[PDB]
Write an enzyme that holds these catalytic residues in place. Structure first.
Site, mmCIF file in Angstrom:
data_model
loop_
_atom_site.group_PDB
_atom_site.id
_atom_site.type_symbol
_atom_site.label_atom_id
_atom_site.label_comp_id
_atom_site.label_asym_id
_atom_site.label_seq_id
_atom_site.Cartn_x
_atom_site.Cartn_y
_atom_site.Cartn_z
ATOM 1 N N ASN B 377 32.815 24.297 0.871
ATOM 2 C CA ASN B 377 32.111 23.815 -0.303
ATOM 3 C C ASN B 377 31.421 24.988 -0.983
ATOM 4 O O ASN B 377 30.502 25.592 -0.406
ATOM 5 C CB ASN B 377 31.082 22.745 0.057
ATOM 6 C CG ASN B 377 30.247 22.353 -1.126
ATOM 7 O OD1 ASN B 377 30.688 21.579 -1.969
ATOM 8 N ND2 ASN B 377 29.043 22.910 -1.223
ATOM 9 N N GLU B 378 31.847 25.284 -2.217
ATOM 10 C CA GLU B 378 31.193 26.288 -3.052
ATOM 11 C C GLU B 378 31.161 27.639 -2.348
ATOM 12 O O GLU B 378 30.192 28.390 -2.460
ATOM 13 C CB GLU B 378 29.771 25.851 -3.430
ATOM 14 C CG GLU B 378 29.696 24.501 -4.098
ATOM 15 C CD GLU B 378 28.339 24.212 -4.724
ATOM 16 O OE1 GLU B 378 27.336 24.847 -4.335
ATOM 17 O OE2 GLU B 378 28.272 23.324 -5.601
ATOM 18 N N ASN B 429 32.767 21.222 -8.561
ATOM 19 C CA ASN B 429 31.387 20.730 -8.588
ATOM 20 C C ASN B 429 30.756 21.167 -9.919
ATOM 21 O O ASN B 429 30.360 22.327 -10.063
ATOM 22 C CB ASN B 429 30.555 21.309 -7.430
ATOM 23 C CG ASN B 429 31.048 20.908 -6.033
ATOM 24 O OD1 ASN B 429 31.877 20.010 -5.852
ATOM 25 N ND2 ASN B 429 30.493 21.573 -5.021
ATOM 26 N N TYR B 435 22.347 21.264 -15.186
ATOM 27 C CA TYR B 435 21.983 22.681 -15.074
ATOM 28 C C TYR B 435 22.429 23.430 -16.335
ATOM 29 O O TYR B 435 23.288 24.301 -16.303
ATOM 30 C CB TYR B 435 22.618 23.308 -13.842
ATOM 31 C CG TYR B 435 22.072 22.845 -12.522
ATOM 32 C CD1 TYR B 435 20.697 22.812 -12.278
ATOM 33 C CD2 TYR B 435 22.937 22.431 -11.502
ATOM 34 C CE1 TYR B 435 20.204 22.380 -11.044
ATOM 35 C CE2 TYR B 435 22.450 21.992 -10.271
ATOM 36 C CZ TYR B 435 21.088 21.967 -10.049
ATOM 37 O OH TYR B 435 20.620 21.534 -8.838
ATOM 38 N N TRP B 508 27.549 13.122 -7.223
ATOM 39 C CA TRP B 508 26.498 13.695 -6.389
ATOM 40 C C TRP B 508 25.165 13.112 -6.877
ATOM 41 O O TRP B 508 24.692 13.463 -7.966
ATOM 42 C CB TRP B 508 26.517 15.219 -6.479
ATOM 43 C CG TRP B 508 25.717 15.886 -5.387
ATOM 44 C CD1 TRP B 508 24.477 16.453 -5.498
ATOM 45 C CD2 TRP B 508 26.100 16.028 -4.007
ATOM 46 N NE1 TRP B 508 24.069 16.946 -4.273
ATOM 47 C CE2 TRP B 508 25.047 16.704 -3.346
ATOM 48 C CE3 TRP B 508 27.234 15.658 -3.274
ATOM 49 C CZ2 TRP B 508 25.096 17.014 -1.989
ATOM 50 C CZ3 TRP B 508 27.285 15.967 -1.943
ATOM 51 C CH2 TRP B 508 26.221 16.643 -1.301
ATOM 52 N N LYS B 529 19.140 13.528 -7.141
ATOM 53 C CA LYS B 529 20.312 13.159 -7.921
ATOM 54 C C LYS B 529 20.909 11.830 -7.496
ATOM 55 O O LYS B 529 21.980 11.467 -7.993
ATOM 56 C CB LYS B 529 21.386 14.256 -7.854
ATOM 57 C CG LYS B 529 20.917 15.562 -8.450
ATOM 58 C CD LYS B 529 22.024 16.405 -9.031
ATOM 59 C CE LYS B 529 21.482 17.766 -9.555
ATOM 60 N NZ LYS B 529 21.006 18.621 -8.416
#
Ligand SMILES: Cc1cc2nc3c(=O)[nH]c(=O)nc-3n(C[C@H](O)[C@H](O)[C@H](O)COP(=O)(O)O)c2cc1C
Ligand SMILES: Cc1cc2nc3c(=O)[nH]c(=O)nc-3n(C[C@H](O)[C@H](O)[C@H](O)COP(=O)(O)O)c2cc1C
Ligand SMILES: Cc1cc2nc3c(=O)[nH]c(=O)nc-3n(C[C@H](O)[C@H](O)[C@H](O)COP(=O)(O)O)c2cc1C
Ligand SMILES: [Ca+2]
Ligand SMILES: [Ca+2]
Ligand SMILES: [Ca+2]
Lengths: 638, 639, 638
Positions: B377-378, B429, B435, B508, B529
């Site tokens: 992930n990321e 994502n 953001y 998310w 979130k």
């Protein structure tokens, strides 16, 4: 006036031997309500940890409101507790069931102040309780608050009381209400505004005196009486302390307007009308969390008590939480409150009985649901008599509107002189559970009533243990759900038909924690509940009482958990507050019965796998049984 | 084979010197599940206690059933643990999210045996996760059992696996089911009895082999397909190890029979039919108890997710509990499972990526809800990183020939990065509209990647927006209001749910969750979130935007029930509903009817005095209240 | 009982993907001892490979003598290790410096069993050391052995210890020696034969007991005391486990009989007599091979230390090899041993301090050379204080025969609380190297001894860097051989004259590996040694100590590597333990000196190429100089 909740994230250990100088970094974190005995005091061995433990938490002036004084308020520290601020002792208390406070203002030297609270629940010949059938769960198990107030404020230092005291006299269809208040560091410059509001927030009486005149009588015409469950009407007295034009502090309480008597032959009287007190007792704990109860847990306990239909609760064996008493006010339950002066007279415990009793009356005087103050429970199980006279006279001098009572152990000779001290008495009898025959209960009470016809006699305990065990041969000591149903069936018939018994209290409404017990197949609990310790299962004996006390219509099959039965013809009990029940076995009808005492005892064929449906009017219940060749041994404790 | 629960009353401490030799008497009593970060890892400061803590409990033979071997089974020990029996080390494990076991028969030399488990969640360069937006709750936060088995028994020692591996193949109307089994200390004379049972427990196939033959193929004629929410049909496979005439050990597992494809243009296909994957992600924690979750907590989470109507859950960022995966299999949810290979490639974390992924696949191969294994992930927040992915990807393809690999890619990572070409499918994502950027960018950003890589199936593995109890009539990115999060998700729904090529979407997150380093929004230690709050008690308005699009339970929901006092003379009032037409009534008189095809009913309503609002669609109703004020209620404002 | 060498030809890789199922074929072959940091950890930039590495080797049952049990013994795996036998994990260990063992019999199921050892030396918050001035060389850098024993055998499972504990007590001319032994799977019908033997292998004591009586007190008549370098006499205890008439297992250990005090005014005392401890520290590494040291390397290090004449070694910063401690026993050196509790207290590090101290004491209890256990080194560079109170109590609990100590960073305040915990303390002072001036040292020590007259005070470190740079104007920070010699001349004069300093330890006897060091013109090394990293060059400071400490007569010409010198008249230092030195320049006397402090400072004409001869009695040394117009910048670091 603002109340700052101070529950979140205290540091905690059993492993410390001195107040820490700086905030501990490796202790266990807890958020209050908290008990360190929630596990080890509910599982047997009488081994729950008893001793001294520490709670630490920083108080930050920056996060506080501006006010002239700051109080630490502890609603429950069990049992003895020492408060420290920045290493300095500022308060000490003995009594695990009452509110207590300490002004900490002069100690908040820094921006980051260390509050250490030490709590001790060990053994001594000084602090009640010391010997009793329940766990003395240690810790800060009720909220801790910070109270910020103006330099002049209603009193915060007199035995944890509300600072305000409310006494109604019923004059016909009106009522006069005395609202006395108490102040600390007042100025005669200031005034006091007394207001009573009705159930709608609608101001119904007002008057204004000086701050030196700390009492006032308001009138309330056509008063709505607090009349139990019929109409639990509550007003609200509010009093403001006003400097010039600015209300600088206020306080308030709810209250009900009623009269009552406890008559040696007619039983309990409420606003001139007989109002039989038939009900239960409740301990302030719950499976898995010791006594660290949340508001929802109190709500759920009184909900279930309301569903059963009790008109009284005995809140044994100590001061309960203010919120639980409030619920009793709103619902119109009639309450017995008492101190933990229990089992064994300790000659050095005299002080602690007086201070817990004073706390109990001062902090609870305004609750219209409380009618008796209990001095002791099973205390005989001359110094003892003096201790009782002293308590009896202090209550009568503190409270002219209520009566005193005791709960007497079963064996105590009725001619014991201490029985003559309180205004009324009740006995704790277990005939048909611990010795004797259940049929002995009525004749025992009758005999007492013949000997002492002017002493109002209640039943403050009676009960029978029950867990998930079953039998077709119910007897004393098998611990079965079925024997306990029968026991309460017989107790209801004897006690609910004796008007002179002024109050009955099942022991107990719920299974509860008592770590010294090791019996019935599940240790560390008393299993005399009508409901289990986690409040999730209602035993059959719950529905026997509901049948007599609820007007909500229902039908309930007993024995649902007793499925595998050996006999060819099995007994099936049905409870209903409806007059006639018909039971069906696999669609086939095993007859109709009318039981005016609400207990319908059927005899039913037991072949193959059968479904049972009881039918009374628009209401039905359903259970199932199965024929078997050998007793299902899982059903049996032995 | 007997399973003894072993959760009750351990002695716990954080500040213990050495392994104790006698049962401690002043430690803190906990009953597992337990995490010691339940308070300090949900409240801010990035200061939750990380270190070695001890659990101690006595094992008494007088309570154990008679058996040849006793195994200590740990469902979850976060993050690293060591097991001692009467003082001797017998086991060490790294990986806070998987089952591991150890045979302790030899060390039970006394009637009372001190069992001590040391558990550690400190900082190091070796055990994933180290860098991530959630609290690494330390402790024995899942069950500990004792397993008593015969000397010959199904394997308890291979990477915490069940010892049975079921692999169905669909052939027309029937199914071919390979069942493989793994033995410890088995005799050549023992047999293996394989049975497959029906949803009602009815036997439908049965075969036998000698113990030396640890595979069998059983036929299921006229198979009931596991077909998602439509029919989550589950069979059970049972294998008993038989000595002479008697079963000495038995294992079982449920399984479902299905095929799927992840088509780069038609999205997710299940059993030959298009089956859109529209859903949420879920962390395995909860307010107040850390990750010390009970079965009822798992059931509540999935009940709420089922009520929203999600057809998929992304179970980020690590292996969840067996009971939650079973719940997914029973409820027909399609699942993405992954390991905590997260944020930042640790060169020394490679062994632990291998280890956790082996445990992930071995322990979860049987769950029919799982269709993809997530490698990372990321991870790009470089050559060593690429090799770590090749190895994970080839090992997963080696171990499981029936599922696909995926990754979750960080927003800014260039779409031409080489690691995007490694797994079978990818997802991104993105937080355009939270953001920075704007919520309208998502749709076209996905369209542009799709244009560039038309054969790479592309999903949205994170998207979302923060929201607490703040309110406004001018919703804007960064006011943290319920209303802006509602607008954001309306717009994501419109963009995402109308693009069939997006193979899976995961809000998310389904719930607010613990993240001790977060200090924003008015309440620290949490990512807000969620569509539902951390304690599961409050469904935010955005929850009902999704229910209106995905659930077939008829409802009508009034938004903004907590935004009571409003300055404006005429105020917007949004209703969500899966019914075709809603009517709004203001103090009893209609303010009109609307027919919103996208289920977002925006009414304009007079705001005078105090007003009661009733929305009506068919036979379903909801109620709210507003009132008129001259100045904005500064309690609605985060500033 | 057979010990098999298992060092031979391991497959090794730095890529730690997974444990290989089959023996690998393209890894790199190493024979232990081995460290993968042998080059990249000795050359600067703090960049040596830290991470997990795999060792793989086949164990073949046929090559093993027959026995009931087989233990894998690892003498050193740095830092944390996991062992796998046929893919099955069988042990885990944290601690790069101690022996650990595991029974692997049950996993030897194939004829070719695949042993895999994963070794890890990465960054974490849990395993010491993490913060220190030395390279944490990863690997199997000490022996691995297979130990084959009988079903009943002396304990191999207890913190890597030997299985035999030997405590001499003395009174008068005789000695009494307690021998304790620890058994695994012994049977009641077995016996223990204890024996004590002479230095010549002659039995001096013998006694039999039953396997259940695992302690014996044997007496040595007219015992030869272990008396330091003067007479390092060692006995040998052996105990055999006998079944019937058959010894089925035996263990043994050498030991020494000696008492000692650490007197705060008189310094160190050994067997009643003052025995001053003046010496050096020693790191367990060597240029070119990391810490993968062979027995010949341990022997050469100790030879060089004996040639210098040290009476003490501080074996910093961690447990050393058993073979080095045995040499220390054999030569009569007095040892300080310590764990790597160093530079910075880790809160998550407590457990690893406990385990390493347990292993340190259990494995080294029998070594008569060892007198003090070191708890920590510069640990301050409250959880800390508790950590030290735990270590101090545990050692005092385990070893009633040795004292505890610490090594305190230079700037640490002398009133700090942790200095009060150990029996004795020492400081690491670098006045004259890391700032300050060399004259400060003695007076600083005086202040402490004034401030704390009964805490024995030593100097655990002091030193000065030196490489092949030279100057006629020595100043701190020129890294010249000449400045280091001056520094050590002044430290000897200050330190060796103060009886109350119980132990002095030069930092360090040899240059050593420190990969974060990037100074003095050769990175990767701490160049504070008296001797270079490859043990090939004795710096002049080595001889200044030898002149004070050795009894072998010698004369040493300083400055041999400083040939080209600009000045017409140049300084020439001679070290000698002889009273008088005459120095000749091209055969012409340049002066006759006597120096009580052994530091002979001559001045000499520098003209042409000159040959120097230093003469004391029959002992001489020789060197050469040369007159030059300009300074040889090859002598200059900058
Ligand atoms: C229900 C009740 C509440 C009382 N609350 C307060 C109070 O809050 N503050 C106060 O100063 N006195 C209060 N009192 C008054 C005391 O009971 C009374 O002054 C007593 O006789 C004198 O107490 P002392 O002996 O402690 O001085 C209260 C009395 C009662 C009956
Ligand atoms: C889903 C799955 C489960 C497995 N379970 C076991 C098991 O329980 N016991 C066993 O001995 N082997 C089991 N295996 C076989 C291993 O994969 C086999 O040992 C392999 O050669 C080792 O490679 P690995 O380290 O990648 O797992 C399983 C394989 C798969 C795919
Ligand atoms: C120098 C020394 C060596 C020891 N060797 C052993 C040993 O080999 N086996 C053993 O069981 N205990 C050994 N012990 C310690 C005692 O037997 C100990 O009290 C007990 O066995 C375990 O205690 P523990 O909880 O500290 O591990 C040794 C103790 C000391 C001081
Ligand atoms: Ca208990
Ligand atoms: Ca925190
Ligand atoms: Ca380097």
């Amino acid at each position: 006036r603002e109340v700052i909740n101070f529950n979140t994230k205290w540091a905690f250990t059993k492993e410390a031997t001195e107040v820490p100088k700086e905030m501990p970094e490796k202790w266990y974190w807890v958020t209050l309500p908290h008990s360190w005995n929630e596990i080890d005091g509910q599982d047997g061995g009488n081994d729950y940890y008893r001793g001294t433990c520490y709670y630490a938490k920083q108080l930050k002036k920056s996060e506080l409101p501006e006010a002239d004084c700051y109080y630490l308020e502890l609603r429950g520290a069990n049992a003895s507790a020492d408060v420290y601020v920045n290493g300095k002792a500022v308060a000490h208390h003995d009594g695990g069931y009452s509110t207590w406070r300490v002004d900490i203002t002069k100690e908040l030297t820094e921006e980051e102040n260390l509050i250490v609270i030490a709590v001790e629940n060990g053994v001594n010949d000084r602090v009640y309780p010391q010997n009793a059938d329940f766990t003395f769960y240690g810790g800060l198990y009720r909220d801790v608050n910070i109270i910020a107030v103006n330099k002049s404020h209603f009193d915060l230092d007199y035995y944890g009381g509300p600072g305000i005291k409310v006494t109604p006299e019923i004059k016909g269809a009106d009522a006069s209400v005395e609202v006395e208040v108490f102040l600390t560091n007042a100025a005669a410059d200031q005034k006091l505004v007394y207001t009573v509001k009705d159930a709608e927030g609608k101001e119904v009486a007002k008057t204004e005196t000086a701050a030196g005149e700390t009492k006032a009588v308001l009138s309330i015409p056509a008063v709505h009486l607090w009349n139990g469950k019929k109409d639990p009407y509550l007003y609200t007295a509010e009093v403001a302390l006003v400097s010039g034009e600015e209300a600088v502090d206020a306080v308030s309480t709810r209250f009900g307007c009623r009269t009552f008597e406890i008559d040696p032959e007619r039983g309990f009287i409420l606003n001139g009308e007989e109002y039989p007190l038939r009900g239960v007792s409740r301990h302030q704990d719950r499976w898995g969390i010791g006594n660290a109860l949340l508001p929802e847990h109190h709500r759920e306990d009184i909900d279930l008590i309301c569903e059963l239909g009790a008109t009284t609760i005995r809140l044994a064996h100590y001061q309960h939480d203010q919120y639980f008493y409030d619920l009793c006010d709103e619902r119109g339950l009639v309450i017995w409150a008492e101190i933990p002066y229990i089992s064994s007279h300790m000659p050095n415990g005299r002080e602690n009985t007086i201070s817990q009793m004073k706390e109990l009356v001062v902090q609870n005087y305004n609750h219209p649901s409380i009618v008796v103050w209990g001095l002791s429970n099973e205390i005989t199980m001359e110094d003892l008599l003096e201790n009782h006279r002293i308590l009896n006279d202090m209550v009568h001098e503190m409270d002219h509107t209520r009566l005193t009572t005791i709960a007497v152990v079963s064996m105590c000779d009725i001619h014991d002189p201490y029985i003559q001290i309180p205004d009324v008495i009740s006995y704790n009898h277990y005939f048909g559970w611990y010795g004797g025959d259940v049929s002995m209960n009525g004749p025992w009470m009758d005999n007492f009533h013949k000997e002492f016809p002017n002493i109002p006699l209640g039943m403050s305990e009676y009960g029978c243990e029950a867990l998930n065990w079953h039998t077709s041969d119910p007897k004393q000591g098998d611990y079965t759900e079925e024997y306990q149903a029968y026991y309460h069936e017989e107790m209801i018939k004897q006690l609910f038909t004796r008007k002179y018994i002024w109050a009955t209290h099942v022991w107990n409404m719920f299974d509860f924690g008592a770590d010294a017990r090791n019996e019935g197949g599940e240790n560390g609990q008393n299993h005399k509940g009508l409901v289990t310790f986690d409040r999730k299962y209602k035993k059959d004996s719950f529905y026997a009482y509901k049948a007599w006390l609820s007007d909500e219509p229902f039908v309930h099959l007993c024995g649902k958990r007793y499925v595998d039965r050996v006999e060819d013809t099995t007994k099936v009990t049905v409870y209903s507050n409806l007059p006639e029940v018909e039971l069906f076995v696999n669609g086939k009808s095993a007859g109709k019965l009318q039981a005016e005492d609400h207990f319908f005892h059927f005899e039913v064929p037991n072949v193959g796998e059968s479904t049972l449906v009881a039918v009374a009017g628009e209401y039905k219940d359903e259970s199932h049984i199965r024929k078997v060749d050998t007793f299902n041994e899982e059903y049996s404790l032995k």
